[PDB]
Design a binder for this molecule. Structure first.
Ligand SMILES: *[C@@H]1O[C@H](CO)[C@@H](O[C@@H]2O[C@H](CO)[C@@H](O)[C@H](O)[C@H]2NC(C)=O)[C@H](O)[C@H]1NC(C)=O
Ligand SMILES: *[C@@H]1O[C@H](CO)[C@@H](O[C@@H]2O[C@H](CO)[C@@H](O)[C@H](O)[C@H]2NC(C)=O)[C@H](O)[C@H]1NC(C)=O
Ligand SMILES: *[C@@H]1O[C@H](CO)[C@@H](O[C@@H]2O[C@H](CO)[C@@H](O)[C@H](O)[C@H]2NC(C)=O)[C@H](O)[C@H]1NC(C)=O
Ligand SMILES: *[C@@H]1O[C@H](CO)[C@@H](O[C@@H]2O[C@H](CO)[C@@H](O)[C@H](O)[C@H]2NC(C)=O)[C@H](O)[C@H]1NC(C)=O
Ligand SMILES: *[C@@H]1O[C@H](CO)[C@@H](O[C@@H]2O[C@H](CO)[C@@H](O)[C@H](O)[C@H]2NC(C)=O)[C@H](O)[C@H]1NC(C)=O
Ligand SMILES: *[C@@H]1O[C@H](CO)[C@@H](O[C@@H]2O[C@H](CO)[C@@H](O)[C@H](O)[C@H]2NC(C)=O)[C@H](O)[C@H]1NC(C)=O
Ligand code: NAG
Ligand code: NAG
Ligand code: NAG
Ligand code: NAG
Ligand code: NAG
Ligand code: NAG
Ligand code: NAG
Lengths: 113, 216, 187, 139
């Protein structure tokens, strides 16, 4: 874990060098040869660059619009191949927002089926 | 009497993942070359673990993503006497959890190629699903489950639920206040139990412990 | 996976059993063979364990399949979403390679209108409640309808029952309740 | 191998969880003790670390009295049976009530139906059955 320098009596910590899994995010090759690369569990340092909790994602464009999940990356981030086309990354939508009109004396009754 | 009871279930487990080569022959060329002679003994392990990791997210999806639409409660909590405040979300929090969700989260507690992958849906997103479920349940009864959310008054919802158990609906109307009081008190007790009984969360704590032991 | 493993040496001089035997005397060939036996034995054990576990998953699925058949094809189900989304009417099974397919037919309420309601109606101080259905109002008149399809009807003593009085029920409204007996005796 | 086996247990639990949600939160259940002890009314889900929690609300009958009963009542030789509920007696008078909650009512032709006669039913008792039509025609 740690060693005492034999010449000069100080204590040195030994931390093994950075490493991590590599994922390749791809639409099928029947569509496109273009890919995005995720470096798992690292910072965008050692390695069109988006830092996520999953690791460092390179090659995907970061988009503000949410959508339904396609190719999942992790921690609420998904990727897809869209428009001319390229790989994009976004925070996934959970679905359409819809307030229900509640009142103490109102009922909705269906008329057909 | 109206009584209120707590049922607890595990859904998921931690998504570990292991580099078979690095674990066995870390950073040694001589060792690696010997390892090769065993064929696919290495890669098929990586595959098995992957299978598990994926189903973990599937599990979560099947339980929580049951509602197609994210419904939200009205600004006016006029639910005929019934108080829902400890189970509905708290707007003031950095993650919009209910009071009782917070109690639950406060009860449950390397370099050898062994890593951990995150879950797909965040705590916040699960909380939004629960919220939608609860908003649905309160204002549209069971309708949202069959199809469209059709609104109804809370008290009328309860009158059907009384007929479901073979008690005539006049009973609910005539005893409206007592029923609301019993409801309110029962929820209060749930808080007291959760806040004081460590063992309440044992079923979940056990899962954590088994996985930790396996890695050690 | 199982097949390919045969081609591994597991540290022997050759994966080919005959090549060891054709080149070494027994006292040496035995050593080489033991290395292959160990490797191959291990390989089978792995395969079998995987098959047992996988078989377990299939059996669970088979039990569920069998259960739908019974409580869904042979019957009608009030367990929710057990037999598809909607209110279940009936189901038809069709076979397929290594499984079964189930066509569920359900009923889904389709178009809807916003009406005004009440828990009870006051008549002569009596509180009338619907025997089935809901008191609804179109804005000017009160009707009683079933809870699943709009079939408005005149409020009468054959649609409601009486229990207690006007001073108890919260949100009770005033209306009139028609007595179908009255005009039979009136005429 | 251990992880595979353990994962199997979790998945079974996950399937049960998913099933309660559907038949319990999104409806009412007449499967007994499936949604807590008592007669189920409704349920509310709350999330937790690596699982889900279910608050079940149920109805539990609470205080009770010993009454005398009969399967049927004889009137004019006719056997009257309750359409719903039970013929009960306070020791002097016969009433008809719902099963789950004591709510006594006068025995009338709108509470009972007629089938067969007095000579068949074991434990049949004598009483009178009021006809609500009679006083409308009487007056
Ligand atoms: C209920 O919904 C159906 C649509 O699903 C309506 O039926 C249509 O009727 C018009 C004639 O007015 C036709 O042009 C369509 O071809 C019909 N469609 C089908 C599939 O039958 C119907 O009008 C509605 N009925 C009620 C009760 O409002
Ligand atoms: C629902 O119940 C809670 C209590 O559990 C009420 O919140 C309290 O309100 C009083 C003021 O009247 C405060 O002194 C307390 O500190 C509050 N407690 C909590 C836990 O927030 C709430 O207002 C009730 N709602 C209604 C309309 O009755
Ligand atoms: C509420 O329901 C009543 C009954 O259908 C409606 O009143 C009738 O309206 C028609 C004209 O469209 C007349 O021919 C009838 O004589 C009316 N009956 C009565 C009892 O007055 C009434 O219009 C409905 N209200 C709305 C706005 O739909
Ligand atoms: C429903 O109708 C009754 C009349 O049948 C109303 O009763 C009145 O209530 C007020 C307030 O206590 C009294 O001052 C009157 O003397 C009552 N009238 C009678 C004839 O007894 C009742 O308030 C009505 N509700 C509405 C909102 O219209
Ligand atoms: C059985 O039920 C009847 C009806 O409630 C009781 O008889 C009544 O008793 C009260 C006195 O408490 C009188 O004011 C009524 O006029 C009585 N009605 C009749 C029909 O006689 C009777 O007391 C009950 N028996 C017991 C022991 O509870
Ligand atoms: C119920 O009432 C009837 C009368 O309506 C009783 O019938 C009598 O039964 C005995 C035994 O066979 C006969 O001797 C009588 O002649 C019958 N009476 C009539 C008027 O027909 C019946 O026994 C009664 N039950 C009890 C236990 O009181
Ligand atoms: C895949 O590519 C081939 C062309 O080689 C084409 O015939 C086929 O329709 C494609 N399929 C899909 C699903 O994209
Ligand atoms: C990446 O490095 C920066 C320092 O340059 C640090 O602020 C940040 O927290 C790091 N991110 C992660 C997730 O390692
Ligand atoms: C989204 O829009 C904001 C401005 O509201 C901007 O600051 C941000 O860079 C945008 N992000 C992406 C992913 O395009
Ligand atoms: C009922 O009323 C509200 C008023 O805001 C309206 O938005 C809604 O569409 C109405 N619902 C139906 C089913 O007509
Ligand atoms: C319904 O709500 C309104 C307040 O918006 C109130 O005037 C009325 O008394 C309420 N009725 C019932 C049945 O609670
Ligand atoms: C009914 O009668 C018995 C007589 O031994 C008594 O012990 C019991 O408490 C009574 N039950 C009720 C519910 O009053
Ligand atoms: C009930 O039991 C008693 C014996 O204790 C008997 O006299 C009477 O005939 C019985 N009645 C019925 C309906 O069996």
């Amino acid at each position: 874990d740690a060693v005492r320098d034999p010449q000069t009596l100080e204590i040195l910590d030994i931390t093994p060098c950075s490493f991590g899994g590599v994922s390749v995010i791809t639409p099928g090759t029947n569509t496109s040869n273009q890919v995005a690369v995720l470096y798992q569990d690292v910072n965008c340092t050692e390695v069109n660059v988006f830092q996520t909790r999953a690791g460092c994602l390179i090659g995907a464009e970061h988009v503000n619009n949410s959508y339904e999940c396609d190719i999942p990356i992790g921690a609420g981030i998904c990727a897809s191949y869209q428009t001319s086309q390229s790989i994009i990354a976004y925070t996934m939508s959970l679905g359409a927002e819809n307030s229900v009109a509640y009142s103490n004396n109102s009922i909705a009754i269906p008329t057909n089926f | 009497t109206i009584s209120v009871t707590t049922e607890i279930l595990p859904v998921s487990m931690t998504k570990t993942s292991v580099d078979c080569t690095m674990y066995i022959c870390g950073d040694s060329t001589e060792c690696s070359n010997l390892l090769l002679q065993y064929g696919s003994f290495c890669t098929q392990l990586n595959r098995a673990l992957t299978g598990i990791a994926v189903e973990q997210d599937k599990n979560t999806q099947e339980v929580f993503a049951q509602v197609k639409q994210i419904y939200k409660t009205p600004p006016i909590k006029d639910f005929g006497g019934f108080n829902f405040s400890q189970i509905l979300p708290d707007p003031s929090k950095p993650s919009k959890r209910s009071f009782i969700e917070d109690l639950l989260f406060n009860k449950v507690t390397k370099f050898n190629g062994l890593t951990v992958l995150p879950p797909l849906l965040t705590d916040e997103m699960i909380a939004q699903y629960t919220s939608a479920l609860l908003a649905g349940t309160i204002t549209s009864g069971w309708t949202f489950g069959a199809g469209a959310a059709l609104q109804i008054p809370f008290a009328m919802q309860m009158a059907y639920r009384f007929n479901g158990i073979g008690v005539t609906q006049n009973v609910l109307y005539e005893n409206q206040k007592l029923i609301a009081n019993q409801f309110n008190s029962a929820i209060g007790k749930i808080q007291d139990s959760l806040s004081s009984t460590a063992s309440a969360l044992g079923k979940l704590q056990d899962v954590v412990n088994q996985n930790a032991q396996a890695l050690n | 996976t199982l097949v390919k493993q045969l081609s591994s040496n597991f540290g022997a001089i050759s994966s080919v059993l005959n090549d060891i035997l054709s080149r070494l005397d027994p006292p040496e060939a035995e050593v080489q063979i033991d290395r292959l036996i160990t490797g191959r034995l291990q390989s089978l054990q792995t395969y079998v364990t995987q098959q047992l576990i996988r078989a377990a998953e299939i059996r669970a699925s088979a039990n569920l399949a069998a259960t739908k058949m019974s409580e869904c094809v042979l019957g009608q189900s009030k367990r929710v979403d057990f037999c598809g989304k909607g209110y279940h009417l009936m189901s038809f099974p069709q076979s397929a390679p290594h499984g079964v397919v189930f066509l569920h037919v359900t009923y889904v309420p389709a178009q809807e209108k916003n009406f005004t309601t009440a828990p009870a109606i006051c008549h002569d101080g009596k509180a009338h409640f619907p025997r089935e259905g809901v008191f609804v109002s179109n804005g000017t008149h009160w009707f009683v309808t079933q809870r699943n399809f709009y079939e408005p009807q005149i409020i009468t003593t054959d649609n409601t029952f009486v229990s207690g009085n006007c001073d108890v029920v919260i949100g009770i409204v005033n209306n009139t309740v028609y007595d179908p007996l009255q005009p039979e005796l009136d005429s």
